[PDB]
Amino acid sequence: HLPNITILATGGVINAVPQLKDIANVKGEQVVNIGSQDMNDNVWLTLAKKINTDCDKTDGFVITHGTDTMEETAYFLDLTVKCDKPVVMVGAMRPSTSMSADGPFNLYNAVVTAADKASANRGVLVVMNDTVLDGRDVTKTNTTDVATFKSVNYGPLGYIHNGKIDYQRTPARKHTSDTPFDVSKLNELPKVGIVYNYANASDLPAKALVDAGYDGIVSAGVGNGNLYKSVFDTLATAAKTGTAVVRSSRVPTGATTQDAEVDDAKYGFVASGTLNPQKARVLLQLALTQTKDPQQIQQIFNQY
Amino acid sequence: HLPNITILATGGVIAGGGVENLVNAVPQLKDIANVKGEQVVNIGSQDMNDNVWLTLAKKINTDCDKTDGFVITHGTDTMEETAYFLDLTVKCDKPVVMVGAMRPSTSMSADGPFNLYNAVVTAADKASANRGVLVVMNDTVLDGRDVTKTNTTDVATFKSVNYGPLGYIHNGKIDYQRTPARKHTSDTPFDVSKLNELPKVGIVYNYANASDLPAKALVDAGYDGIVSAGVGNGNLYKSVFDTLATAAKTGTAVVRSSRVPTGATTQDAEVDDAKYGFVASGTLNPQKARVLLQLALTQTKDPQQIQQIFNQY
Amino acid sequence: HLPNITILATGGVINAVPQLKDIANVKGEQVVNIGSQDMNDNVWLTLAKKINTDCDKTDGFVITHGTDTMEETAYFLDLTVKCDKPVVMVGAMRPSTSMSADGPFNLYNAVVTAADKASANRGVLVVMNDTVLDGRDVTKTNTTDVATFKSVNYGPLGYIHNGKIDYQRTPARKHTSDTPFDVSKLNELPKVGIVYNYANASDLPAKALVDAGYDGIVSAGVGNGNLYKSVFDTLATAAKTGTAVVRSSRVPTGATTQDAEVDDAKYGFVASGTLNPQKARVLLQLALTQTKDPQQIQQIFNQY
Amino acid sequence: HLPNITILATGGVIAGGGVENLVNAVPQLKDIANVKGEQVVNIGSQDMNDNVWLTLAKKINTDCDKTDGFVITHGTDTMEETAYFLDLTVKCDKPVVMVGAMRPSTSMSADGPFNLYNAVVTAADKASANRGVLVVMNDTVLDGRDVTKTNTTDVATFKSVNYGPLGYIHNGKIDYQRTPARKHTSDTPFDVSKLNELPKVGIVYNYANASDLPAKALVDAGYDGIVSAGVGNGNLYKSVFDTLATAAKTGTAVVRSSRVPTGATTQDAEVDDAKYGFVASGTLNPQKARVLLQLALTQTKDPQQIQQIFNQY
Numbered sequence A, C: 001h002l003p004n005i006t007i008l009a010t011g012g013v014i015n016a017v018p019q020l021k022d023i024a025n026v027k028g029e030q031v032v033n034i035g036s037q038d039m040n041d042n043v044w045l046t047l048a049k050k051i052n053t054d055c056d057k058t059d060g061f062v063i064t065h066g067t068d069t070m071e072e073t074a075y076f077l078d079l080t081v082k083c084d085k086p087v088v089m090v091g092a093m094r095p096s097t098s099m100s101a102d103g104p105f106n107l108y109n110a111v112v113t114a115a116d117k118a119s120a121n122r123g124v125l126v127v128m129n130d131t132v133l134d135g136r137d138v139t140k141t142n143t144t145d146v147a148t149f150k151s152v153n154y155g156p157l158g159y160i161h162n163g164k165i166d167y168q169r170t171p172a173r174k175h176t177s178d179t180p181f182d183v184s185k186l187n188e189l190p191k192v193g194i195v196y197n198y199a200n201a202s203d204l205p206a207k208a209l210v211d212a213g214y215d216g217i218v219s220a221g222v223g224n225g226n227l228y229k230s231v232f233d234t235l236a237t238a239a240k241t242g243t244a245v246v247r248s249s250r251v252p253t254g255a256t257t258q259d260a261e262v263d264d265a266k267y268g269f270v271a272s273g274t275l276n277p278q279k280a281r282v283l284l285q286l287a288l289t290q291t292k293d294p295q296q297i298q299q300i301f302n303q304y
Numbered sequence B, D: 001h002l003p004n005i006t007i008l009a010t011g012g013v014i015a016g017g018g019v020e021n022l023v024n025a026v027p028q029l030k031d032i033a034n035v036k037g038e039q040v041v042n043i044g045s046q047d048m049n050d051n052v053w054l055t056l057a058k059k060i061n062t063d064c065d066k067t068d069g070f071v072i073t074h075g076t077d078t079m080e081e082t083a084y085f086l087d088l089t090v091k092c093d094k095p096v097v098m099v100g101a102m103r104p105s106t107s108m109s110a111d112g113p114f115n116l117y118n119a120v121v122t123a124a125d126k127a128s129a130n131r132g133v134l135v136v137m138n139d140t141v142l143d144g145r146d147v148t149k150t151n152t153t154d155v156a157t158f159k160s161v162n163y164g165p166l167g168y169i170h171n172g173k174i175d176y177q178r179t180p181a182r183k184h185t186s187d188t189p190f191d192v193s194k195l196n197e198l199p200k201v202g203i204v205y206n207y208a209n210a211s212d213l214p215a216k217a218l219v220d221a222g223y224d225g226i227v228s229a230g231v232g233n234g235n236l237y238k239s240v241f242d243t244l245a246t247a248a249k250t251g252t253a254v255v256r257s258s259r260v261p262t263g264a265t266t267q268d269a270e271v272d273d274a275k276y277g278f279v280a281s282g283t284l285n286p287q288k289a290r291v292l293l294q295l296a297l298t299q300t301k302d303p304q305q306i307q308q309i310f311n312q313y
């Protein structure tokens, strides 16, 4: 009578939750054990492969992860997982040995989410603080708050009360099996770096990446993806010299749009829309497995 | 008797689609002030830089006695940075109010006119004094330390995301209910009157699989400081951590901030600052932490004194 | 080549926008002229009838309205409009004669929204401050701010930049032609009143309504729809005496849930979910045109 | 030397699923204070009332010299109301900190334990003094006037939605950056030491097609005041307006507030307060405007003096 749920563990600050046995038959597997500040491409490749391979062995997946880069992993899996069963990511803001630790109830709600049949076909989900959040818009909004995880542009899909979810939204951007990114045979990802804009910004980070032959650069622009003059110069050069350039923003909400202050087509640049720099990096890496044409990368940025 | 208010124009979308045309665009300003304008520069704030900052702060400090208040018209993109620099360096204790516009003056429902008006109202209010340098946008008075641009296009983008606004503006009047506690203006030791340049401080971003090359480049270039835009509570990808540990043992100041948009990068978390000679930025986001680090480095290179400065200002 | 758009005007603080001619052939009609603080049942009946009757005469509707009760009208139309062409509501926070008045660009964006073919089948929409918001979750969050209108539980559907909308969400709750509420032959609505909970609350408002024979009472509860003891007593009486009782909350976000501190089935009560008191009142009035069974009213509250 | 901190328990979900079991539930409290507990009542705060308010305020004022700080355990539902009443009536200038819990103590990841701890930390901090009565929830210190419950179930529900929090709590320490400007505690004229009851003030809601019957009922009952939960900027449906106009001309105090969850109900908007003898509530939401109106009516019935009180406190 209960669903089969596989917990895949990666570490982070998050048996000790026996009330799980009320809602699913849980099996645990250690994939890695790291703080997610050391999250990397290899871990991501491992996770997508495991999920895709093991899909027909379970009814859903919960991935325990650190909270620091949970938002990057959730979007990577959102674009590469082809399993059409729920994949829910979860962490904790307080250690398990601390007073009023969030990990037990968080895990419980993540299992609830992975077990719910209404959760399929919603893409990869993050479940934190009683809320089901899509892997594309979810981000860490505060450095220490238990309520930190929000979908700051388009909102949560669902709230969880008493083990039940009232879903009122689903992401429209294409995800999972509706994307072309197939990661099954890949052992590395294209090299993509992020540079930060501010007053009197150095061009040296952007130059270091270009000198290294990086495949992509994401700018964390000011305002609507704007670039400090030295940084602009160096990127405009990179984009005609073999490096794809995506303009995002350091600004924590809203789109980096087309048709603002930057002639994207003149420079061969791509506007990130609502993807923040770390998220744009995810979709840039995957675009680069398929194309290096900035027109075609911009299309990818317009659909996923 | 109306107050005398000086507008110092620097450019931005508010001056776009100089200063003398701005005033004539808002004649209602004559109802609340005698306004006089000076163009200091005319740049997009994406191109703001240490020299415009020194020029403004020197100018305000020099011209303090000649006016009753200052309004700075400025691009939105880096207004939060300029605001905090001026907050630490102006010694004038007449109000200094920054203002921009998120829509072009020629566009429908342009926010520039009513924003300017409100910035003047604020600079004319005797209660605006002794609150530090201010940002006035969308009917709201915001302190220069906490104010940040939250959204890429919304007219309401500017928010003090941790501690809230100082006061709200309705029908040309302000109900002030808050003032920043952190020391500002004439309570800081920072004196830029005889400074021709600022120490070099760069910013590096942290994410999964972060490259150390951007950090290495800034070390190779002999940077006086580096501000880390960390993950979560000021955390660093290992490669980045390692370059920044090595740098701090050879006299580069290293301040851990966070790419996360609200909350403090705290002391006593996952990083042993005292061990590496790193500084925790508190609620200062990376571009704000740069502002303070640059000024910290005019006084001191000691990591412990620099930490004390990040606890007071 | 341009869409036919009918502006229906009701008043509020919001020709003078000639740039409309770039995006549609606009026709205006005065239905009423009031401040929306005097919005009433008759105006709503008029509006739904007009839209339904005139549906095949236009490509979309923009309704100009005051901002005070725009959120109540948008949900009423959201449940009663059977036209499957966009119906967009719009107002202004600043008078048209004031500096940097929001009405021109707001109207422009509302027309953009009503003209967009992607806007059909999304229910009744409110467009304010560059944002397309669903009529069920949208509410006035601040007394004076131009950015006041937000969908505070589930987020916007879409942002508008340079005359274009990137839609990433649509409401899941049933709306428009997927609801049973047919208003075409009705000339009045069931009488529904709202009472407020706080410390030491008087039962006198609730009693006045009951004494008046009201069909429904919405409680603006404390917390998770809780009721001051005197008010609870009076409502528990009303619910067994011919008055339907819906528990909402004065709290501006989140659900009044089932299975919390109030035994709803014991008392014959209905939990409002995410509907605030004014919105619950809308759906209560319409439920009462079809049923007075609290089990069946609770179902309606669970689907619309 | 640890400080002496008194917990006054009133009930709520934190005391649920008295006071002596609460302490034993949080033994770590012994690391930061000598705690002593008194049960004052044991009710859900949905049932909070004028008598519990008088009892708490009298008690705190009486017992001020016998302890170093007070923590009040309380239901979440009306904590914002109690907090503001105590903010206007306690004359003790040791910290007074309110705390509840949104999950039951028996539930997974119960917030009650760590909340209590933080409330004690706050009440023990000498810097918490002279800031008025405080609410401590979700690692955040909030002033009693602005604090409100924003969400029906979230552990982070409590926010000062207009002017922000006072300070944040990390590893048992507080960085205070704000204090309320509005007069509180020993700067208010409100003295409830010899009061056996409070004036009668009710709340009426405004929406489309609003009934006047709830307003009429409160007038018929001879209410001393009525607080309107208005639409938008304190506006009233016509029937409601008319009953409340008639009432104010026969000595009922009428305060326009707003059902809208942030922002002020302003003077000089669509309602001519001076004409009807109405008062504008400012940022006080309806349940908060009641708190102040009740206390205003212990001093005065004049609409103009009551307006002045709504501008100062």
Ligand SMILES: N[C@@H](CC(=O)O)C(=O)O
Pocket (backbone or CB within 6 Å): A011, A012, A013, A014, A034, A035, A036, A037, A065, A066, A067, A068, A069, A091, A092, A093, A094, B232, B235, B270
């Ligand atoms: N540094 C931790 C933070 C957490 O899990 O809260 C991690 O992300 O692995």
Ligand SMILES: N[C@@H](CC(=O)O)C(=O)O
Pocket (backbone or CB within 6 Å): A223, A226, A261, B011, B012, B013, B014, B043, B044, B045, B046, B074, B075, B076, B077, B078, B100, B101, B102, B103
């Ligand atoms: N790029 C412009 C943006 C603005 O003014 O809104 C600037 O910062 O100068």
Ligand SMILES: N[C@@H](CC(=O)O)C(=O)O
Pocket (backbone or CB within 6 Å): C011, C012, C013, C014, C034, C035, C036, C037, C065, C066, C067, C068, C069, C091, C092, C093, C094, D232, D235, D270
């Ligand atoms: N009282 C006006 C408010 C507005 O339109 O801004 C109305 O709702 O009609």
Ligand SMILES: N[C@@H](CC(=O)O)C(=O)O
Pocket (backbone or CB within 6 Å): C223, C226, C261, D011, D012, D013, D014, D043, D044, D045, D046, D074, D075, D076, D077, D078, D100, D101, D102, D103
């Ligand atoms: N109904 C409870 C809610 C809580 O404590 O969270 C109370 O206010 O007493």
